[PDB]
Amino acid sequence: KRVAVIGAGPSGLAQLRAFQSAADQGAEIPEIVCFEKQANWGGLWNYTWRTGLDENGEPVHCSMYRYLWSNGPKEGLEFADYSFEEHFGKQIASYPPRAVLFDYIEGRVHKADVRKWIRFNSPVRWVSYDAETAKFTVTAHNHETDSTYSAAFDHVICASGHFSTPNVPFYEGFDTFNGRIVHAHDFRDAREFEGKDVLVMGASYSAEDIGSQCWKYGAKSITSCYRSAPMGYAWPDNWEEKPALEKLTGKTAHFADGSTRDVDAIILCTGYKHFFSFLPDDLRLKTANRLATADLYKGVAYVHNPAMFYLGMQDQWFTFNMFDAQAWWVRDAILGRITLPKDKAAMLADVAERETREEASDDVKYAIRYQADYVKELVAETDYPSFDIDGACDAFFEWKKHKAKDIMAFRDNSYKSVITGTMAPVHHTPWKEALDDSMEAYLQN
Amino acid sequence: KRVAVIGAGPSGLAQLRAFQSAADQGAEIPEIVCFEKQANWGGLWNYTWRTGLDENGEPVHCSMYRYLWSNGPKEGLEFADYSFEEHFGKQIASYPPRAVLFDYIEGRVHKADVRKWIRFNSPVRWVSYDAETAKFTVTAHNHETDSTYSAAFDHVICASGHFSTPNVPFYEGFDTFNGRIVHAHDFRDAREFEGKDVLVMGASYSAEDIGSQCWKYGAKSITSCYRSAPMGYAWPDNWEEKPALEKLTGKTAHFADGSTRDVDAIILCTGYKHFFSFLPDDLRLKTANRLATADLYKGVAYVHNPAMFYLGMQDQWFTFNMFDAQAWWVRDAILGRITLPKDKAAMLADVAERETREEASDDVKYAIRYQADYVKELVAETDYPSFDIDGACDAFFEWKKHKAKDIMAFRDNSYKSVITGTMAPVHHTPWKEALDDSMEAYLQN
Numbered sequence: 033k034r035v036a037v038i039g040a041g042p043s044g045l046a047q048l049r050a051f052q053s054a055a056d057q058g059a060e061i062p063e064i065v066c067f068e069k070q071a072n073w074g075g076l077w078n079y080t081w082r083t084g085l086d087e088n089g090e091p092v093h094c095s096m097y098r099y100l101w102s103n104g105p106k107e108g109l110e111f112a113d114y115s116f117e118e119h120f121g122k123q124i125a126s127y128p129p130r131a132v133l134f135d136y137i138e139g140r141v142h143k144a145d146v147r148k149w150i151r152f153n154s155p156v157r158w159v160s161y162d163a164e165t166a167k168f169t170v171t172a173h174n175h176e177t178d179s180t181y182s183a184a185f186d187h188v189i190c191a192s193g194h195f196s197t198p199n200v201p202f203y204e205g206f207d208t209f210n211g212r213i214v215h216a217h218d219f220r221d222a223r224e225f226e227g228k229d230v231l232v233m234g235a236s237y238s239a240e241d242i243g244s245q246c247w248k249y250g251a252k253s254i255t256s257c258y259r260s261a262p263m264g265y266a267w268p269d270n271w272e273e274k275p276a277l278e279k280l281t282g283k284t285a286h287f288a289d290g291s292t293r294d295v296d297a298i299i300l301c302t303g304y305k306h307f308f309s310f311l312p313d314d315l316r317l318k319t320a321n322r323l324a325t326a327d328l329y330k331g332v333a334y335v336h337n338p339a340m341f342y343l344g345m346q347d348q349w350f351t352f353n354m355f356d357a358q359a360w361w362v363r364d365a366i367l368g369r370i371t372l373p374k375d376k377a378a379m380l381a382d383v384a385e386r387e388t389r390e391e392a393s394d395d396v397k398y399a400i401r402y403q404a405d406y407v408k409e410l411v412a413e414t415d416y417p418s419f420d421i422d423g424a425c426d427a428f429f430e431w432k433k434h435k436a437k438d439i440m441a442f443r444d445n446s447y448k449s450v451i452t453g454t455m456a457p458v459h460h461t462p463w464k465e466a467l468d469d470s471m472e473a474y475l476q477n
Numbered sequence: 478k479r480v481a482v483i484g485a486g487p488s489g490l491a492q493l494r495a496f497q498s499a500a501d502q503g504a505e506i507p508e509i510v511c512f513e514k515q516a517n518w519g520g521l522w523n524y525t526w527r528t529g530l531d532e533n534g535e536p537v538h539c540s541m542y543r544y545l546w547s548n549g550p551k552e553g554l555e556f557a558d559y560s561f562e563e564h565f566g567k568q569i570a571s572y573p574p575r576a577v578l579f580d581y582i583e584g585r586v587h588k589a590d591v592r593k594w595i596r597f598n599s600p601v602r603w604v605s606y607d608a609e610t611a612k613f614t615v616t617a618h619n620h621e622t623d624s625t626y627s628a629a630f631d632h633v634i635c636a637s638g639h640f641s642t643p644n645v646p647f648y649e650g651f652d653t654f655n656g657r658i659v660h661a662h663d664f665r666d667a668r669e670f671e672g673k674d675v676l677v678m679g680a681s682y683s684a685e686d687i688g689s690q691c692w693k694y695g696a697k698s699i700t701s702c703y704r705s706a707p708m709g710y711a712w713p714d715n716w717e718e719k720p721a722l723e724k725l726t727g728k729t730a731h732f733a734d735g736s737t738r739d740v741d742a743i744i745l746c747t748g749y750k751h752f753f754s755f756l757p758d759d760l761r762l763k764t765a766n767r768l769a770t771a772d773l774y775k776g777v778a779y780v781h782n783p784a785m786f787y788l789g790m791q792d793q794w795f796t797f798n799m800f801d802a803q804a805w806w807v808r809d810a811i812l813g814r815i816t817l818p819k820d821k822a823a824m825l826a827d828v829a830e831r832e833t834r835e836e837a838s839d840d841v842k843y844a845i846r847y848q849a850d851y852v853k854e855l856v857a858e859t860d861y862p863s864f865d866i867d868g869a870c871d872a873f874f875e876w877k878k879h880k881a882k883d884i885m886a887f888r889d890n891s892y893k894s895v896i897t898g899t900m901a902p903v904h905h906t907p908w909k910e911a912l913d914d915s916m917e918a919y920l921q922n
């Protein structure tokens with residue numbers, strides 16, 4: 033067999049690691065080719081100063097910015113087969129900067145000798161499936177040689193992410209506003225906004241954190257705005273939450289309650305689309321961003337062609353070790369170890385069950401536990417280690433409590449690794465004062 | 478016969494008009510489908526506040542910005558078959574704002590009844606060619622219905638532009654700079670830079686004009702930097718021209734002559750790439766931006782597959798009337814009124830002749846006349862009516878002298894129409910004071 037993996041972010045890398053681990057235990061594995069658009073692996077964790085289009089003219093994948101740190105407890109994303117202690121030679125604090133988690137992600141696969149399977153600077157242009165040959169044809173462009181070519185595969189595993197194509201709504205006045213307007217995707221350096229009055233549109237992670245970076249790096253004020261309900265945290269005194277934006281007139285933002293605030297810049301933290309520029313209708317996943325992803329049997333096998341799989345397409349509480357659970361499962365399906373239902377109706381019913389169960393309660397603890405149950409389900413079916421998933425849940429619950437206590441100080445907390453049991457040490461510098469985001473500053477005294 | 482046109486900017490619109498004109502005169506024409514990525518026609522002239530990726534997730538085509546006006550004399554682009562005075566019912570000044578030129582472009586195509594052939598929100602994903610069937614297969618994605626489809630064609634005419642995929646060179650310090658760094662392609666509102674010291678990198682039209690907008694809308698200072706040769710105009714007191722950038726250290730820019738200065742913002746006016754994300758090796762034009770475009774017989778027929786054509790791929794002195802000449806020629810080749818050489822070597826020799834002749838002199842007037850000669854060559858070979866091309870050259874020559882005299886005031890000049898023979902009136906407001914860019918303001922009596 034031959035298998036194509038699209039993407040070398042955490043999910044695609046997990047897929048490579050999964051196959052290699054099976055080979056380490058004596059199993060025959062397919063030939064694997066991984067196509068990656070960027071010049072290096074790491075996916076969203078691979079920072080670039082560039083925005084919009086990259087050095088090759090392709091859409092910039094990176095949505096991360098300077099000064100970004102882990103926004104959940106690292107203990108919730110630890111690889112079960114490669115602990116933080118194994119990688120770093122010691123335990124570290126619970127919310128590491130981007131560069132530190134990048135180092136961890138790449139350490140696992142560097143040691144696994146899977147880089148040689150990856151073709152970098154090679155965006156996939158198209159995938160088609162031919163029922164006669166039972167092959168997928170992947171067409172890719174190699175930017176190193178400026179040559180487009182194609183190759184045939186028995187399986188395609190799409191791990192191309194869903195937090196890179198921005199959702200960018202228009203509001204009245206956006207086109208006549210005379211200040212900076214930027215989506216979270218293209219945000220890079222919070223220092224740009226020092227001394228400024230910023231409008232942050234949105235009510236989730238990007239709004240929380242981009243507003244917080246603006247705060248930390250000296251913005252004059254933050255006005256965030258929500259649609260349905262406020263974020264409701266204990267914000268600093270130069271941060272105000274407003275209900276829905278109605279319009280901009282000059283510098284003046286008008287909100288649903290009739291209030292106004294003058295602002296210098298607008299940052300749209302309005303989320304992302306699932307978007308695949310390189311897929312035909314019969315292979316192209318269409319879904320909302322949620323815990324039960326449409327049209328994915330077991331959350332991974334495409335119901336309209338289950339020789340195609342997708343990784344990481346769920347909305348995320350769990351991240352790295354969920355992608356691992358998925359990758360090990362997909363590997364085992366491809367190796368013939370796990371049976372796929374032959375009846376499409378059964379695959380559709382699996383998804384329907386997942387959707388109904390996700391919807392049964394709107395409680396946040398219920399949501400976290402729902403995804404934990406998904407990880408448990410997948411891990412039970414393969415030889416990925418059976419780890420303390422409930423303890424990961426405990427870390428997420430404590431994190432939630434810390435955020436509610438003090439949204440600006442939640443990163444100044446420690447949790448126990450569920451892999452090695454070690455309570456994270458206290459970091460040497462409180463988050464607000466830790467202006468240097470380098471791995472070297474973080475890991476050294 | 479079936480023909481696909483990719484793009485509904487000035488070139489694609491010219492192509493539709495060429496076919497409709499032939500039909501109006503009683504000729505049988507092919508079935509025509511025009512695919513356009515944006516929601517409306519006009520190409521670069523269709524303004525959007527959006528940058529990077531559009532509402533559909535596609536690369537934003539627009540490179541135009543607030544306050545943009547015609548940068549050459551309108552008399553030099555005035556449509557051979559449709560005067561400004563006719564469209565507006567009166568004479569107007571010689572450098573109309575974007576909105577005014579868009580209205581003019583639209584007027585002509587509305588009259589032509591060609592919109593029926595255009596599919597908007599429908600980027601082309603791919604074109605392939607089968608030599609056995611002599612058919613192109615065009616795959617396009619309809620963003621309104623979220624459905625990709627394909628269709629077969631005898632010819633493909635690519636009019637997708639070459640001033641939209643930015644050339645974005647890395648210089649030391651760009652990744653660490655504390656300030657806005659933006660390519661011309663993503664520049665929208667000069668007012669963002671009021672009170673700032675702006676660095677403008679480049680020495681062509683974008684550098685001239687974006688620096689000028691920043692000046693007009695209140696930047697504290699402009700520093701422009703060139704690498705090859707200086708623009709060398711008579712700059713205003715707060716504009717300095719420097720040689721090549723060596724690096725930034727913090728906010729300090731260091732130049733090739735050993736000089737330094739601190740800057741708050743950087744605008745990269747470093748040009749664009751010919752880039753086609755949707756073409757395989759056998760169809761994909763590769764060329765520098767120049768008057769003699771590589772691999773294009775008669776500047777339009779792809780030498781490696783002469784059933785494929787390209788419009789507007791040349792660097793531009795002439796624009797609209799050249800695209801018309803090209804469109805009429807391509808139409809005639811497709812209708813069989815013009816016969817292409819059956820010998821590839823002859824086609825390659827045509828391109829080599831054009832390249833050698835372009836290179837024979839580096840004189841600006843020589844370049845302008847070189848492209849005028851090209852327009853004349855094409856017009857002589859079709860039923861496109863000859864017009865006073867030499868008079869248009871005279872307008873460009875006067876424009877060149879006006880820019881050399883006063884770069885900040887060149888738009889405060891008039892030229893004689895080569896279509897109506899009338900000298901353009903003086904505008905009601907000097908360019909520096911004309912802050913309102915609306916069509917209504919411009920046309921006020």
Ligand SMILES: Cc1cc2nc3c(=O)[nH]c(=O)nc-3n(C[C@H](O)[C@H](O)[C@H](O)COP(=O)(O)OP(=O)(O)OC[C@H]3O[C@@H](n4cnc5c(N)ncnc54)[C@H](O)[C@@H]3O)c2cc1C
Nearest residue numbers: 039041042043069075076102103155156192193195344351
């Ligand atoms: C701003 C931001 C901050 C985040 N912070 C955290 C955090 O602190 N903790 C956490 O656990 N999670 C975080 N996440 C979640 C993130 O989803 C996961 O951490 C993880 O990166 C998802 O991995 P992935 O491999 O599924 O997708 P991605 O990381 O998006 O990688 C997908 C890969 O596919 C490649 N690709 C895309 N299109 C093509 C193509 N046509 N051809 C070839 N290759 C292609 C991309 O270049 C990329 O390498 C964050 C997400 C964002 C957007």
Ligand SMILES: Cc1cc2nc3c(=O)[nH]c(=O)nc-3n(C[C@H](O)[C@H](O)[C@H](O)COP(=O)(O)OP(=O)(O)OC[C@H]3O[C@@H](n4cnc5c(N)ncnc54)[C@H](O)[C@@H]3O)c2cc1C
Nearest residue numbers: 484486487488514520521547548600601637638640789796
């Ligand atoms: C900033 C700027 C200012 C300018 N100012 C002037 C001026 O004052 N005077 C002047 O004479 N000229 C000016 N020009 C020159 C400009 O090149 C021409 O005026 C003209 O717009 C070129 O026409 P075009 O149709 O060849 O290309 P474009 O105007 O670039 O249009 C190409 C079209 O192709 C579409 N397209 C691209 N890719 C795809 C795809 N995959 N599928 C479907 N559709 C696609 C685009 O959306 C667009 O509609 C300017 C150019 C720029 C960049």
Ligand SMILES: NC(=O)c1ccc[n+]([C@@H]2O[C@H](COP(=O)([O-])OP(=O)(O)OC[C@H]3O[C@@H](n4cnc5c(N)ncnc54)[C@H](OP(=O)(O)O)[C@@H]3O)[C@@H](O)[C@H]2O)c1
Nearest residue numbers: 101102103201234235236237238239241259260301302303
């Ligand atoms: N490590 C970090 O610090 C960090 C920083 C940024 C992001 N991340 C990650 O990035 C991923 C995505 O987070 P995200 O916050 O960008 O996306 P998200 O969780 O999908 O949230 C989207 C937000 O946009 C809002 N929204 C959507 N359309 C809107 C509109 N037309 N008008 C106003 N609001 C609109 C939503 O509000 P409604 O509920 O009203 O629809 C919602 O608040 C997550 O994994 C997150 O953890 C991490």
Ligand SMILES: NC(=O)c1ccc[n+]([C@@H]2O[C@H](COP(=O)([O-])OP(=O)(O)OC[C@H]3O[C@@H](n4cnc5c(N)ncnc54)[C@H](OP(=O)(O)O)[C@@H]3O)[C@@H](O)[C@H]2O)c1
Nearest residue numbers: 546547548646679680681682683684686704705746747748
């Ligand atoms: N109507 C208007 O007011 C207006 C405004 C803007 C643009 N436009 C239009 O846009 C089109 C393109 O104009 P343009 O000026 O953007 O592009 P251009 O004419 O192609 O010029 C590109 C410029 O970038 C420079 N450059 C390229 N690579 C560089 C690098 N690595 N470092 C430094 N400099 C670099 C080039 O310098 P070298 O010569 O040294 O290579 C050149 O000066 C034209 O049609 C123009 O008329 C119109």
